[PDB]
Design an enzyme around this catalytic site. Sequence first.
Site, PDB file in Angstrom:
ATOM      1  N   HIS A  27      45.480  91.560  30.911  1.00  0.00           N
ATOM      2  CA  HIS A  27      44.405  92.149  31.695  1.00  0.00           C
ATOM      3  C   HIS A  27      44.385  91.777  33.185  1.00  0.00           C
ATOM      4  O   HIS A  27      43.751  92.474  33.978  1.00  0.00           O
ATOM      5  CB  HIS A  27      43.053  91.830  31.068  1.00  0.00           C
ATOM      6  CG  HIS A  27      42.605  90.410  31.267  1.00  0.00           C
ATOM      7  ND1 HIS A  27      42.858  89.417  30.355  1.00  0.00           N
ATOM      8  CD2 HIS A  27      41.844  89.838  32.236  1.00  0.00           C
ATOM      9  CE1 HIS A  27      42.272  88.297  30.739  1.00  0.00           C
ATOM     10  NE2 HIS A  27      41.650  88.534  31.882  1.00  0.00           N
ATOM     11  N   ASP A  49      46.577  90.466  24.162  1.00  0.00           N
ATOM     12  CA  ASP A  49      46.172  90.557  25.556  1.00  0.00           C
ATOM     13  C   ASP A  49      47.072  89.568  26.315  1.00  0.00           C
ATOM     14  O   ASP A  49      46.676  88.955  27.306  1.00  0.00           O
ATOM     15  CB  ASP A  49      44.685  90.195  25.691  1.00  0.00           C
ATOM     16  CG  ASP A  49      44.129  90.482  27.082  1.00  0.00           C
ATOM     17  OD1 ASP A  49      44.632  91.431  27.724  1.00  0.00           O
ATOM     18  OD2 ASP A  49      43.182  89.763  27.518  1.00  0.00           O
ATOM     19  N   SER A 101      41.257  83.193  34.034  1.00  0.00           N
ATOM     20  CA  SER A 101      42.162  83.594  32.966  1.00  0.00           C
ATOM     21  C   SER A 101      43.536  83.047  33.302  1.00  0.00           C
ATOM     22  O   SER A 101      43.908  82.937  34.478  1.00  0.00           O
ATOM     23  CB  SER A 101      42.258  85.118  32.864  1.00  0.00           C
ATOM     24  OG  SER A 101      41.106  85.681  32.287  1.00  0.00           O
TER      25      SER A 101
END
EC number: 3.4.21.90
Length: 149
Positions: A27, A49, A101
């Site tokens: 992402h 992901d 992240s």
Amino acid sequence: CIFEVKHEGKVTGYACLVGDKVMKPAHVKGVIDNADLAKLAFKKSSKYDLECAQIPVHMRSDASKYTHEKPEGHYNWHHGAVQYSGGRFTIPTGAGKPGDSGRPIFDNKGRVVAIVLGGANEGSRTALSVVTWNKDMVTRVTPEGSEEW
Ligand SMILES: [Hg+2]
């Protein structure tokens, strides 16, 4: 081992050299701010992901080992100490924001234990949504209502 993904000159997330692969959340927009890493060919995996590639020989000495071994207790991460219990990593709400992240959650011996993808706010504490290793294979734990960082 940690490298930053930049997008339009702005840090969006991170990339990490774990095992023999080079990881970065799928992402995350941008390209790894490192020549050697940026020119690689990544294999996307929407289930996890995740988006991995292989570490160039000249950086393989720079990887960080991983581990499936994670006993209830406290783990280490850039913003402080993560807490593991009930099969869930959590942190004091506020200590993790969008743009975190890719950041690994190490243990006390340096082994990367999980990689943060985002977190769900459940009050005092936020349950992290992470990519973690199982018996041997990768896995992804996403608490109900996670906000992808
Ligand atoms: Hg790393």
